[PDB]
């Protein structure tokens, strides 16, 4: 399996399996864990050998079918197929092997059916003394124990080759809001700002855009294809207008270029100054603020417009 989206999450809750054996890969994090390739391996294994699907336990099957390697990258899954494969009378379909030249190495389709010796005497093309059938068949009976019941087994193995990853399923999504500071994550773009409708003119191959100095301004959501502007919401320093601790204690605080509608209150060119009343008069002030507006203490802090003379 390559270049496909894996729905591992639905597998855990769609039904119940027999076992789920993972080593080095956490089960719940398979949704965001990434490999390069996925192998779907089809298995038919006796119930007694279900626990024997592990490196260390062998038998008539695990010693000659496909030896389990020490480099497993994946997990085993099996389920009960008694209602589909178990019946009174038995089944004698799937093949055995008694002895061969050597044990089959991991991942070697030695499907061939050559003649091999269990002892040392030659066969001469005729099976007999120390030359037996290298093929037999299963046997499963529901009247027998749990270890003599048929099963269907599917085991996944992965790869981590020197190639870009291709098989991961991002079942992650969130709604879209606007005109609020949101820590958005748009296909890898992480930042903070307010989403607003734009009037730009994109081309249908451009994920996003940046105007000047490598700063992102418009981002295109890859679900409904709209261009959304990006703006970092209001910020700025805070300055305190004080007449000194010895003189008095009442103070007025400034917010640089911040609209107080988003935070007496007086609106100035350098942000809404709060804590001081605006007087219609105009005196020779002492504490400057900006854009011709100032402040002075004479029994509360009051703001004026500068009187040149």
């Amino acid at each position, epitope marked *: 399996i390559s270049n496909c989206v894996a729905d591992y999450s639905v597998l855990y809750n769609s039904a119940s399996f027999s076992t789920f054996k993972c080593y080095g890969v956490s089960p719940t994090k398979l949704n965001d864990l990434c490999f390069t390739n996925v192998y779907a391996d089809s298995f038919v294994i006796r119930g007694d050998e279900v626990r024997q699907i592990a490196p260390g336990q062998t038998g008539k099957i695990a010693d000659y079918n496909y030896k389990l390697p020490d480099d497993f990258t994946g997990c085993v899954i099996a389920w009960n197929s008694n209602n589909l494969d178990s019946k009174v009378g038995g089944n004698y*379909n799937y093949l055995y092997r008694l002895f061969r030249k050597s044990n089959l190495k991991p991942f070697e389709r030695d499907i061939s*059916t050559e003649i091999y010796q269990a002892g040392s005497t030659p066969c001469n093309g005729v099976e007999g003394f120390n030359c037996y059938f290298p093929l037999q068949s299963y046997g499963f009976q529901p009247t027998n124990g749990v270890g003599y019941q048929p099963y269907r087994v599917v085991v996944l193995s992965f790869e981590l080759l020197h190639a870009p990853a291709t098989v991961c399923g991002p079942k992650k999504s969130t709604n879209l809001v606007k005109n609020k500071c949101v820590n958005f994550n748009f296909n890898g773009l992480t930042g903070t700002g307010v989403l607003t409708e734009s009037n730009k003119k994109f081309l249908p191959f451009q994920q996003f855009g940046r105007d000047i100095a490598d700063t992102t301004d418009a981002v295109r959501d890859p679900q409904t294809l709209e261009i959304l502007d990006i703006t970092p919401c209001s910020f700025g320093g805070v300055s305190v207008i004080t007449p000194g601790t010895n003189t008095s204690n009442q103070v007025a605080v400034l917010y640089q270029d911040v609209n107080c509608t988003e935070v007496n209150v007086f609106q100035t060119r350098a942000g809404c100054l709060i804590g001081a009343e605006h007087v219609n008069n105009s005196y020779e002030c002492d504490i400057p603020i900006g854009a011709g507006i100032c402040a002075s203490y004479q029994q509360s802090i009051i703001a004026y417009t500068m009187s040149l003379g």
Partner: nanobody
Amino acid sequence: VQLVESGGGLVQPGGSLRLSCAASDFSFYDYEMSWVRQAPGKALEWIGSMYHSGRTYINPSLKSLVTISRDNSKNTLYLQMNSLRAEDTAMYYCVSNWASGSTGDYWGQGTLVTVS
């Protein structure tokens, strides 16, 4: 055609019928030949298995009842059934590489096995 089958029609119980399974070349004969049945409701039952290595391993209660003969001119297989029963009454297939699943195999035209 790469793989085909022949013979069939109506099989007389007790007698011998020379069934056939032709093909185009021996290079396509990896790795198995098999004449099987898929009865309604019955599980997988395989009546024959001719192997690439010139081996025929059959159910011990069937291999005595079955004669085996393999050809290479037309790459046909000769198999004879006697004392027929109604459990074989299905679309009798000649499946080359039956154990290799339903993608590396050919399903023949089919025939029937009926007992009067």
